[PDB]
Amino acid sequence: SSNVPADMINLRLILVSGKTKEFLFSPNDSASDIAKHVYDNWPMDWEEEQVSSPNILRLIYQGRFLHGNVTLGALKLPFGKTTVMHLVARETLPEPNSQGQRNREKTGESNCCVIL
């Protein structure tokens, strides 16, 4: 990651194991989703603890946990500069069960019932 453009935020993800990964990310991305992404492969559908634990994915904005999945922009990051973060994951399984269960999140999709 060389030269951080004004549309992107340079983010360093530090994992609990003491491994530090740094990549250029978008301020609209969520630190905990990124944490799973920086660990290895892209998160599919909330890599939590198997019997369900959402609080196991949290983000530390060095000294303080801002939230469990709050975005870099929301952490207050000037774009074009390097930001370091500490990420915590607990009892997390790499890929929950591989569903990739998501919502449509796309206009054109979602067939709702009509009557008019």
Side-chain angles (χ1 to χ4, degrees):
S1 306
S2 183
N3 178 270
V4 190
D7 296 272
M8 303 292 293
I9 48 83
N10 189 149
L11 171 59
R12 186 173 183 191
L13 296 300
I14 306 184
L15 300 310
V16 184
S17 187
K19 285 60 178 179
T20 64
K21 306 299 179 181
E22 194 185 288
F23 297 94
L24 186 63
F25 289 98
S26 306
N28 185 88
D29 291 284
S30 51
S32 50
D33 180 89
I34 297 180
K36 203 295 87 179
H37 182 111
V38 296
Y39 267 116
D40 48 72
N41 181 266
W42 61 278
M44 298 183 181
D45 67 289
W46 188 258
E47 294 55 43
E48 63 186 301
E49 178 286 295
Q50 184 178 330
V51 298
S52 188
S53 302
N55 182 268
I56 63 79
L57 294 179
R58 298 178 69 186
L59 57 83
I60 300 174
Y61 185 42
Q62 193 188 269
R64 52 179 173 145
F65 302 78
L66 294 190
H67 209 247
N69 182 266
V70 62
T71 55
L72 288 300
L75 305 175
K76 299 68 183 179
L77 278 60
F79 37 66
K81 71 81 175 184
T82 309
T83 307
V84 63
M85 295 184 63
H86 298 256
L87 297 303
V88 298
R90 299 178 180 178
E91 307 302 83
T92 182
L93 292 65
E95 296 66 87
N97 192 87
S98 184
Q99 283 68 270
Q101 181 179 210
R102 55 182 179 153
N103 194 329
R104 294 293 67 208
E105 305 299 79
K106 179 180 182 61
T107 49
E109 294 293 283
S110 307
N111 296 329
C112 302
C113 302
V114 295
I115 180 63
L116 196 177

